[PDB]
């Protein structure tokens, strides 16, 4: 039964590790969400600035 006990000892270790993995997966998800919101915002600002640069360039060339 000793081997069985060893097996039992393992399974519990695995269980705890699975707990940690769960918590990690959750933190991972939260951060990925935050970064996706951020990337969205970045793309909006980037498009805005691109439009501004195009407009300013057109006006600049107009006066040449």
């Amino acid at each position: 039964m000793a081997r069985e006990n060893e097996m039992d000892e393992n399974l519990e270790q695995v269980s705890g590790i699975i707990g940690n993995l769960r918590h990690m997966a959750l933190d991972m998800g939260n951060e990925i969400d935050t970064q996706n919101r951020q990337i969205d915002r970045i793309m909006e600002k980037a498009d805005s600035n691109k439009t501004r640069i195009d407009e300013a360039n057109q006006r600049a060339t107009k006066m040449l």
């Binding site: 039992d8 399974l11 519990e12 695995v14 269980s15 699975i18 707990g19 993995l21 769960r22 997966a25 959750l26 991972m28 998800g29 990925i32 969400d33 970064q35 996706n36 990337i39 969205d40 970045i42 793309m43 980037a46 498009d47 600035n49 691109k50 640069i53 195009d54 300013a56 360039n57 600049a60 060339t61 006066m63 040449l64």
Partner: protein, 63 residues
């Protein structure tokens, strides 16, 4: 028999698997958004350079 421990651990693993699948699909979304941002950034720096040249011409003409 350790039926409870096994079923519980199994349930935990299943849960974490679901969470991780969700997370992987999310990071794929992130990959798409990042590609789009890469292209946008390239276009942006290009246009910025062109505007720098034009502005240089304006300075040379009016200053």
């Amino acid at each position: 028999g350790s039926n409870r421990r096994l079923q519980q651990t199994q349930a935990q693993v299943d849960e974490v698997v679901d969470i991780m699948r969700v997370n992987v699909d999310k990071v794929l979304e992130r990959d798409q958004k990042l590609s789009e941002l890469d292209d946008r950034a390239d276009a942006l720096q290009a246009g910025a350079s062109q505007f720098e040249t034009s502005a240089a011409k304006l300075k040379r003409k009016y200053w």
